[PDB]
Design a protein around this ligand. Structure first.
Ligand code: CL
Ligand code: NA
Ligand code: NA
Length: 326
DNA sequence: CGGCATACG
DNA sequence: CGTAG
DNA sequence: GCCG
C-alpha cells in the first residue's frame, strides 16, 4: 500500500507522525556527521514514510510491511510509543559530538569534513573559531559574522519583498526575463531559510550571461552583503522595522528549454529529488538532473515544457510542490 | 553482496 | 573543499 | 540501515 520511493506518494508539509519522524531524522543527521551516508538515507526514508501516512502510528503492528522499517527504525518507534522517548536518540541529542557538529555545519562555508577536522582539533564554539581567523576562508568568515541572523527564519512576506527587488534588477539586466520562487516556499512553507529564485527568459539563448548582470545590479543597490556562472549563493540585506537582517538567497539561471528540470530540482525537497533520480535511473533507465532527462540507449534528451511532462516521462503520477515534502 | 542523486562555485 | 535541491 |  505504501510505495517504496518517496516520489511515488504524496508527502504534505504537515502530517500525523511529527514526533516519530523528528526522532528518526536526528539519527539520520547523526549518521551524516559520522560519514555514514547509507544509514543517513535509510533513516531519512523511514522518516519520510511516516510523513506520508494518513493517520498517527499508535501501535508497533502498524509498521509491518512499511518500506524502510527494519529492526533499528522499528525499535526507535517502539520505544517512543512505549515511553515517549528513545534512549539512543536522547543520547545523540546530549552528545558533545552531535551538538558541536550541528553547530559548525550550520555555518555557511563549513561542511561535515571541515566541522569534523575542527572537532578533532578540540574546537567547540563559534567564539573558538573567531579567535583563529587563520584557518577561515572568506566564505566562512561571512558565514560566521552573519551566523546569528542566518539562524532565524524569514517569513513569506519577507520573501515577497525580496522577490520584488530581484525582479527590478532582473528587468534591467534583461527585459522580459522572469523570476520564479522555488525551494521550500514553493512547497508551501510559511517560514524558512531557503530563499531561492529561478530566472529564465522566453527566448532561448537570451539568458546567456545574465547572472553577472543581475548580481552587478543588486550589488550597486547595496543589497549584497556577500557573494563569491549559473548559481549564485548570496547573503542579502533584508529590511526589517527600523533596521535589517542578513538572509541567504540563491539565484539560479536556466535556459527556458531546461526550466522545467531546474524548477523541479530547486523545488525539492532534497530527499524527493534524490528519490526521483534514483527511481528514474533504477526503474526507468533514464538519467535525471536539474538540466534534463537523458535516455542513454537512444542517446537523446527529453524535451519538457512543464513539470507535468517530466512526471509523465517517468511514468509517475503528478505531485504538486505542496506534496513533495518528502 | 552492491547500491545508495547529481550537479555547480 | 564548499554550495544546492 | 535497509532493499533487491
Ligand atoms: Cl552508512
Ligand atoms: Na554549512
Ligand atoms: Na537556498
Amino acid at each position: 500500500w505504501m510505495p517504496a520511493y518517496a516520489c511515488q506518494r504524496p508527502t504534505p508539509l504537515t502530517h500525523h507522525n511529527t514526533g516519530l519522524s523528528e526522532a528518526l531524522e536526528i539519527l539520520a543527521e547523526a549518521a551524516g556527521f559520522e560519514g555514514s551516508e547509507g544509514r543517513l538515507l535509510t533513516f531519512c526514508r523511514a522518516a519520510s514514510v511516516l510523513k506520508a501516512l494518513p493517520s498517527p502510528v499508535t501501535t508497533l503492528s502498524q509498521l509491518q510491511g512499511l518500506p524502510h522499517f527494519g529492526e533499528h527504525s522499528s525499535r526507535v518507534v517502539q520505544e517512543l510509543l512505549e515511553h515517549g522517548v528513545c534512549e539512543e536518540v536522547e543520547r545523540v541529542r546530549r552528545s558533545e559530538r552531535y551538538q558541536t557538529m550541528k553547530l559548525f555545519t550550520q555555518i555557511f562555508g563549513v561542511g561535515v569534513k571541515t566541522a569534523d577536522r575542527w572537532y578533532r582539533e578540540g574546537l567547540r564554539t563559534l567564539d573558538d573559531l573567531r579567535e583563529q581567523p587563520q584557518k577561515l576562508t572568506q566564505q566562512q568568515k561571512a558565514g560566521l559574522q552573519h551566523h546569528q541572523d542566518l539562524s532565524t527564519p524569514v517569513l513569506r512576506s519577507d520573501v515577497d519583498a525580496l522577490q520584488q527587488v530581484v525582479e527590478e534588477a532582473v528587468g534591467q539586466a534583461l527585459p522580459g526575463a522572469t523570476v520564479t520562487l522555488t525551494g521550500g516556499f514553493r512547497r508551501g512553507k510559511l517560514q524558512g531559510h531557503d530563499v531561492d529564485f529561478l530566472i529564465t527568459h522566453p527566448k532561448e539563448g537570451q539568458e546567456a550571461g545574465l547572472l553577472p548582470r543581475v548580481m552587478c545590479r543588486l550589488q550597486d543597490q547595496g543589497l549584497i552583503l556577500y557573494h563569491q556562472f549559473e548559481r549564485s549563493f548570496c547573503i542579502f540585506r533584508l529590511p526589517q522595522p527600523g533596521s535589517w537582517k542578513a538572509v541567504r538567497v540563491d539565484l539560479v539561471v536556466a535556459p527556458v528549454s531546461q526550466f522545467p528540470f531546474a524548477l523541479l530540482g530547486w523545488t525539492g525537497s532534497k530527499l524527493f529529488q534524490r528519490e526521483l533520480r534514483r527511481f528514474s535511473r533504477k526503474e526507468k533507465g533514464l538519467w535525471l538532473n536539474s538540466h534534463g532527462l537523458f535516455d542513454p540507449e537512444q542517446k537523446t534528451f527529453f524535451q519538457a515544457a512543464s513539470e507535468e511532462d517530466i512526471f509523465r516521462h517517468l511514468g509517475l503520477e503528478y505531485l504538486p510542490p505542496e506534496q513533495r515534502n518528502a
